[PDB]
Amino acid sequence: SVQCTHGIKPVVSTQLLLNGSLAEGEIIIRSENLTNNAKTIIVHLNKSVEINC
Amino acid sequence: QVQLLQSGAAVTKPGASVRVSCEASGYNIRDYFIHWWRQAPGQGLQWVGWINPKTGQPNNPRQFQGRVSLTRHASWDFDTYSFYMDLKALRSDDTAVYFCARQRSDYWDFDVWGSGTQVTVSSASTKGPSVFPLAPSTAALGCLVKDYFPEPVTVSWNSGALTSGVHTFPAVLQSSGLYSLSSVVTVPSSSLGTQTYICNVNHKPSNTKVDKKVEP
Amino acid sequence: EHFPNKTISFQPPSGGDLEITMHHFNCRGEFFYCNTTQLFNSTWINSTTIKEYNDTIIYLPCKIKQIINMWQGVGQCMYAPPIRGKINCVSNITGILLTRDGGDANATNDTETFRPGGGNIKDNWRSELYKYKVVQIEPLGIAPTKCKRRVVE
Amino acid sequence: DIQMTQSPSSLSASVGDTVTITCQANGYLNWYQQRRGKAPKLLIYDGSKLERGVPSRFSGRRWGQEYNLTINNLQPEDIATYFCQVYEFVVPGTRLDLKRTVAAPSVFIFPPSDEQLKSGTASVVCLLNNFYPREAKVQWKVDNALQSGNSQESVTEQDSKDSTYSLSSTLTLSKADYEKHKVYACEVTHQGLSSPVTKSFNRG
Numbered sequence: 001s002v003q004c005t006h007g008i009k010p011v012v013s014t015q016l017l018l019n020g021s022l023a024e025g026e027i028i029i030r031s032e033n034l035t036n037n038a039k040t041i042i043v044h045l046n047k048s049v050e051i052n053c
Numbered sequence: 054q055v056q057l058l059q060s061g062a063a064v065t066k067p068g069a070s071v072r073v074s075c076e077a078s079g080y081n082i083r084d085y086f087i088h089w090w091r092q093a094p095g096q097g098l099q100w101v102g103w104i105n106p107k108t109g110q111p112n113n114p115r116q117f118q119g120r121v122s123l124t125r126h127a128s129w130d131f132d133t134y135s136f137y138m139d140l141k142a143l144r145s146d147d148t149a150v151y152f153c154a155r156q157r158s159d160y161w162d163f164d165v166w167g168s169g170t171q172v173t174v175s176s177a178s179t180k181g182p183s184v185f186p187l188a189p190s191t192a193a194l195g196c197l198v199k200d201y202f203p204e205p206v207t208v209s210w211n212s213g214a215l216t217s218g219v220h221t222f223p224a225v226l227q228s229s230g231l232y233s234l235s236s237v238v239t240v241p242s243s244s245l246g247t248q249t250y251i252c253n254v255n256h257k258p259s260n261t262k263v264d265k266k267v268e269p
Numbered sequence: 270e271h272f273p274n275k276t277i278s279f280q281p282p283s284g285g286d287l288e289i290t291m292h293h294f295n296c297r298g299e300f301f302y303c304n305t306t307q308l309f310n311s312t313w314i315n316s317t318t319i320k321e322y323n324d325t326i327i328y329l330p331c332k333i334k335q336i337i338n339m340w341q342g343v344g345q346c347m348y349a350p351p352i353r354g355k356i357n358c359v360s361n362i363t364g365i366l367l368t369r370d371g372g373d374a375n376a377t378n379d380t381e382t383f384r385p386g387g388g389n390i391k392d393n394w395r396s397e398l399y400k401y402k403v404v405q406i407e408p409l410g411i412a413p414t415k416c417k418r419r420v421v422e
Numbered sequence: 423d424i425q426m427t428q429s430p431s432s433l434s435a436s437v438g439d440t441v442t443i444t445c446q447a448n449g450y451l452n453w454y455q456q457r458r459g460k461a462p463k464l465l466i467y468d469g470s471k472l473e474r475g476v477p478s479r480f481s482g483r484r485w486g487q488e489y490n491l492t493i494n495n496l497q498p499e500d501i502a503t504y505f506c507q508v509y510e511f512v513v514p515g516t517r518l519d520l521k522r523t524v525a526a527p528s529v530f531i532f533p534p535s536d537e538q539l540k541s542g543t544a545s546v547v548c549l550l551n552n553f554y555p556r557e558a559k560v561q562w563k564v565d566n567a568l569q570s571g572n573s574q575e576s577v578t579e580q581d582s583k584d585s586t587y588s589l590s591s592t593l594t595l596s597k598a599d600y601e602k603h604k605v606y607a608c609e610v611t612h613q614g615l616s617s618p619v620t621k622s623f624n625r626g
């Protein structure tokens with residue numbers, strides 16, 4: 001139970017999540033239904049890959 | 054209300070490209086995926102892809118990938134959308150009816166379908182037909198139509214007077230690339246030798262009208 | 270694991286707006302659209318052998334836009350002024366947004382292709398608000414007990 | 423990994439009858455009705471739920487992995503094709519018609535007209551009229567020699583009153599073999615007919 005959440009950055013991106021919070025256990029693949037290609041798939045990583053622009 | 058109006062039929066040559074249209078005007082168009090289905094002659098439907106109206110992102114299977122390209126164009130205020138399919142490299146097995154369906158929910162249930170656009174690709178551009186009578190020997194007798202392009206051709210008897218007992222078979226596409234059919238009507242055996250019967254064929258794309266008497 | 274007997278192959282985006290086909294982000298007011306096609310196509314057939322290579326740096330070209338329509342029809346269109354000087358960002362990649370390509374029935378050659386991009390902006394915030402649920406406290410409970418209120422005489 | 427099937431797609435019921443069609447899928451399934459060359463109409467979504475503006479006779483059963491579509495007190499306008507749809511996989515569907523209309527086909531033979539051979543084209547046809555069921559084995563014999571690949575076959579729609587079908591089979595042959603002989607027959611065996619019926623014609 002908490003009173004309110006952690007810091008959430010409103011950063012906006014399209015193909016790669018930026019400035020996020022790493023997964024704890026492992027790579028987690030989340031989708032509303034994995035047998036419905038109209039539903040997007042979110043792959044959330046447990047180790048960052050820095051991109052230098 | 055929803056009015057998923059689709060464009061008319063198209064006839065082209067192998068190796069060409071055809072853009073099949075589709076128009077939606079009567080709902081909140083931006084919140085429902087628009088899918089494309091194709092139907093081979095006398096076969097069940099087949100998936101082609103879906104397009105997201107908001108972002109235009111398409112999704113196609115492996116075999117269609119690389120050739121087909123789905124696109125959308127919104128109006129000034131998104132009240133009217135137009136969806137197009139550019140099917141590059143039209144090959145032999147592309148003669149099919151194309152539907153633009155509207156997905157409604159997460160069950161992939163399509164409450165609204167488009168009227169349909171018959172797309173056919175081949176050589177032998179529009180030309181006149183050849184009409185063959187059948188020599189008579191209640192019975193049945195009729196005429197035959199051959200080597201016309203493209204569909205359709207209608208056969209009327211006695212210049213729009215006789216239509217009872219007509220059996221106009223669906224047209225068949227032979228190996229040449231042309232179209233043919235045979236239309237027969239039933240008639241009492243006592244009418245032969247006393248009544249004059251004529252078969253009239255109208256071919257609108259070729260603007261050819263042929264009326265032929267049938268006699269023994 | 271979710272697709273047990275197929276090979277996994279990535280492919281670049283197949284079309285759409287410039288905000289879908291290219292990785293879009295922001296630095297100091299300048300709006301970047303990076304290509305990202307060297308990151309997202311490959312094939313993983315059976316992991317038959319480990320392939321060793323040398324260290325490489327992937328260089329993704331990026332375009333820059335000024336007339337920005339961030340949200341397609343609800344957000345106000347904007348013009349981002351140029352920024353004087355050199356722009357440099359160092360950021361982390363903590364997630365990927367994929368979209369499986371639809372399959373067929375006549376022939377599936379044991380392959381599945383995932384193309385990046387896709388989804389709406391909400392999926393950028395579902396990635397953070399997936400742990401949290403809001404509940405309302407009902408602090409009034411009723412249970413039987415052997416006590417009886419002292420009735421006044 | 424979606425596996426789905428469909429009924430044998432050949433069943434006949436009379437007017438005012440009850441019919442059930444079964445599918446074996448493992449995903450959100452819908453039931454569509456399609457006419458001949460027309461935009462299919464959704465009937466049932468999510469196995470059993472009924473759609474607005476649909477006759478009440480249609481109903482759905484969600485049991486195990488089997489999905490049942492039931493149509494009660496069939497009307498003459500319900501003779502169409504019906505298919506169950508999963509996300510991106512669609513079976514061809516099922517075929518509908520009226521039963522117990524068994525009859526011997528009427529056989530007609532029409533030799534090619536004289537003016538057809540003046541263009542160097544030969545086409546011999548044997549006509550089948552008023553037959554049921556549609557499935558008929560039409561074989562061509564050129565003096566008891568089977569011809570394969572040169573015949574085109576078509577079947578007309580089910581007519582309104584008689585509910586009988588008519589088949590047209592066109593056999594295409596070279597000019598040499600047609601004009602060298604006299605007798606040619608297109609005999610067809612049908613479940614309706616009791617005996618092999620053959621139509622002939624005398625040149626004169």
Ligand SMILES: *[C@@H]1O[C@H](CO)[C@@H](O[C@@H]2O[C@H](CO)[C@@H](O[C@@H]3O[C@H](CO[C@H]4O[C@H](CO[C@H]5O[C@H](CO)[C@@H](O)[C@H](O)[C@@H]5O)[C@@H](O)[C@H](O[C@H]5O[C@H](CO)[C@@H](O)[C@H](O)[C@@H]5O)[C@@H]4O)[C@@H](O)[C@H](O[C@H]4O[C@H](CO)[C@@H](O)[C@H](O)[C@@H]4O)[C@@H]3O)[C@H](O)[C@H]2NC(C)=O)[C@H](O)[C@H]1NC(C)=O
Nearest residue numbers: 031032033034035036447448449450451484485486487488
């Ligand atoms: C993505 O979307 C898809 C949909 O497209 C969705 O798929 C669903 O997946 C869930 C779980 O994976 C399925 O739910 C399971 O269904 C099992 C089978 O249900 C059938 O059988 C039930 C029992 O019948 C017995 O006898 C028959 C023969 O008569 C036999 O074949 C069966 O195997 C079984 O032995 C039957 O009750 C059930 O009927 C359902 O629907 C009716 C009407 O809606 C309802 O009244 C019933 O109560 C019931 O819900 C159906 O006929 C089922 O065995 C299984 O049950 C297990 O879990 C429960 C709860 O934990 C336990 O109590 C039970 O003992 C079992 O351990 C479970 O219910 C569901 O059917 C799928 N739906 C479709 C349409 O395919 C995916 O989940 C989606 N993905 C994500 C990530 O969300």
Ligand SMILES: *[C@@H]1O[C@H](CO)[C@@H](O[C@@H]2O[C@H](CO)[C@@H](O)[C@H](O)[C@H]2NC(C)=O)[C@H](O)[C@H]1NC(C)=O
Nearest residue numbers: 022023024025026027028044045046047048270
């Ligand atoms: C991030 O998650 C991955 C899982 O995908 C972890 O990879 C595993 O690491 C262990 C190390 O003991 C190996 O034994 C496993 O074989 C790895 N799994 C795979 C599928 O390769 C990785 O260790 C995690 N990293 C961190 C920092 O948490």
Ligand SMILES: *[C@@H]1O[C@H](CO)[C@@H](O[C@@H]2O[C@H](CO)[C@@H](O)[C@H](O)[C@H]2NC(C)=O)[C@H](O)[C@H]1NC(C)=O
Nearest residue numbers: 049050051052053326355356357358359360361
């Ligand atoms: C991000 O990029 C900048 C410049 O593109 C990097 O700064 C240079 O890094 C190179 C690496 O070999 C050095 O040779 C230069 O001397 C650095 N400075 C300049 C002005 O070019 C920076 O290091 C990069 N950051 C990360 C984390 O890779």
Ligand SMILES: *[C@@H]1O[C@H](CO)[C@@H](O[C@@H]2O[C@H](CO)[C@@H](O)[C@H](O)[C@H]2NC(C)=O)[C@H](O)[C@H]1NC(C)=O
Nearest residue numbers: 281282286287289290291303304305306307330
């Ligand atoms: C991102 O870059 C790739 C190349 O790295 C582009 O792919 C090329 O696109 C052109 C445009 O028609 C083709 O002619 C080329 O054959 C493609 N491949 C190569 C290797 O050049 C891609 O188009 C770029 N992204 C966008 C959105 O333009």
Ligand SMILES: *[C@@H]1O[C@H](CO)[C@@H](O[C@@H]2O[C@H](CO)[C@@H](O)[C@H](O)[C@H]2NC(C)=O)[C@H](O)[C@H]1NC(C)=O
Nearest residue numbers: 019020021022046047048049050359360361362
């Ligand atoms: C980008 O990722 C790196 C590594 O994942 C972050 O570096 C660490 O971040 C954690 C935050 O939980 C700090 O506690 C550590 O002190 C940081 N350094 C090391 C060496 O672990 C980095 O902070 C991330 N960048 C942003 C902007 O979040």
Ligand SMILES: *[C@@H]1O[C@H](CO)[C@@H](O)[C@H](O)[C@H]1NC(C)=O
Nearest residue numbers: 126127128129130131132133
């Ligand atoms: C505006 O102009 C562009 C280019 O001239 C054109 O493509 C578009 O159709 C026009 N209308 C709208 C509503 O964007």
Ligand SMILES: *[C@@H]1O[C@H](CO)[C@@H](O)[C@H](O)[C@H]1NC(C)=O
Nearest residue numbers: 270272273274275276315379
């Ligand atoms: C699928 O993969 C597993 C593990 O690689 C293997 O044991 C199995 O034979 C494969 N095929 C099927 C049909 O499970």
Ligand SMILES: *[C@@H]1O[C@H](CO)[C@@H](O)[C@H](O)[C@H]1NC(C)=O
Nearest residue numbers: 279280281306307309310311
């Ligand atoms: C990745 O890029 C293209 C994208 O289609 C792909 O065909 C190719 O095999 C891969 N490698 C290179 C070097 O292009």
Ligand SMILES: *[C@@H]1O[C@H](CO)[C@@H](O)[C@H](O)[C@H]1NC(C)=O
Nearest residue numbers: 442444483485486488489490
């Ligand atoms: C319903 O489906 C079952 C299969 O589960 C089948 O045996 C049955 O005939 C169908 N119809 C009815 C009315 O039960």
